[PDB]
Design a protein around this ligand. Structure first.
Ligand SMILES: *[C@H]1CC(=O)N(CC)C1=O
Ligand SMILES: *[C@H]1CC(=O)N(CC)C1=O
Length: 178
């Protein structure tokens, strides 16, 4: 369990990849970590981030309710341990809007391309680039499933407690924001 200070990470290599920028000596690269017992992100090493700090873009900070320099608690995250079999995303509904032509199929491809294997949960706020434009994505709801079942046993979830891994078979539903 690490204690890290939140810093802004606007560089597009990170800001568009929806990752938690960490120092190589705080966490290994590309693993799941959970912040403040609620927010799960995939890690990404950065040599330009002070050991003891963790970088997030504006949307991720808004989601966690973290202000700059705010101390935060981070721990390696084990999805199985957390939710057992109901660990994969069967579907995910996203509220999408232009950052401060609507193609559902293309937006979905880009989403899987950029975030496959990442964990998502309702309420999660992230930034995604699509054909030269930046968009704010808010995960509205999720449908967690056990890949072993021919159909979901659980209902569509709206709470941040339900977390699931994005796969190439996850149905992605976008909603032209407001
Ligand atoms: C966050 C992580 C990183 O290395 N950068 C570039 C300076 C960020 O924006
Ligand atoms: C966002 C979109 C994408 O494909 N990447 C890298 C694989 C991003 O960072």
């Amino acid at each position: 369990t690490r204690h890290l200070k939140v810093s802004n990470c606007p560089n597009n290599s990170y800001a568009l990849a929806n990752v938690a920028a960490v120092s190589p000596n705080d966490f290994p690269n590309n693993i799941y970590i959970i912040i403040d017992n609620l927010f799960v992100f995939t890690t990404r090493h950065s040599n330009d981030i002070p050991p003891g700090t963790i970088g997030f873009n504006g949307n991720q900070r808004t989601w966690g309710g973290w202000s700059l320099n705010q101390d935060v608690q981070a721990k390696a995250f084990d999805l199985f341990k957390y939710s057992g079999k109901q660990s994969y995303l069967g579907s995910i509904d996203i509220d999408i809007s232009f950052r401060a032509v609507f193609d559902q199929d293309e937006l979905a491809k880009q989403f899987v391309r950029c975030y496959e294997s990442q964990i998502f949960s309702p309420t999660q706020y992230l930034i995604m680039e699509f054909q030269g434009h930046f968009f704010d994505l808010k995960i509205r709801n999720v449908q967690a499933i056990d890949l072993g079942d021919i159909e979901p046993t659980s209902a569509v979830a709206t709470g941040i407690e339900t977390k699931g891994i994005l796969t190439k078979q996850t149905q992605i539903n976008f909603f032209k924001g407001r």
